């Protein structure tokens, strides 16, 4: 895993 990309709005949603 590289960079420090921002997570999408729903990336933490089941």
């Amino acid at each position, epitope marked *: *895993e*590289q*960079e420090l*990309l*921002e*997570l*999408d*709005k*729903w*990336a933490s*949603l*089941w």
Partner: antibody
Amino acid sequence: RITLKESGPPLVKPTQTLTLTCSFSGFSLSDFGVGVGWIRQPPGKALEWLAIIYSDDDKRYSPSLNTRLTITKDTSKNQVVLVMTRVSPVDTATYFCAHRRGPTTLFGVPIARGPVNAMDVWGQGITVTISS
Amino acid sequence: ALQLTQSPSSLSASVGDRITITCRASQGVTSALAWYRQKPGSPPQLLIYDASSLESGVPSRFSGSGSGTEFTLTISTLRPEDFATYYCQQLHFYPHTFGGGTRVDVRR
């Protein structure tokens, strides 16, 4: 039942400001988590993600264009506006707006991420040329 | 940003053929991967969302698979309207990114 249409000038001069409008029907920017994004396609090239705005006014921009892009919305008019400042011929392309579904909800409760992973409905697209 | 490598870039096929297009992500995007079909002069059309879910109204000949970094779009039986360009897109990280595209033309 979802329809989106882009409107704007077909020709703009370098260094000027480009304003594109997306008018839609079939959904409401009031729908929980719904999003409207913009993608451009330069002559004979691949699709390029530009920005997205959601029902809660949350918004994101392509990092290499964040200083020139601004996205807004008016939920009572079913429209989303994309503003691009200091344009140049590199910006010549066909611009598309698109709808992104919100998560699955059960009686208003968000229960599944699934549906949000894609831009399910795209507008016809508007060709914009930047030249002096 | 997250790089998506679509391969092959170009593919030759015949009506009735079975083709598979791949997309590799420089890092895990879980299942946040969508596939689109774009015909000349038209806007992209959604085929598969969330890596393998078939979009409503899309012919059953289209299927998608994968999770993490490797994904594939498959068309069991190629139809004339399928000779076009296809794109993958990841929506797990910002900025959302599309693959370079895969054109599918008529073989001879």
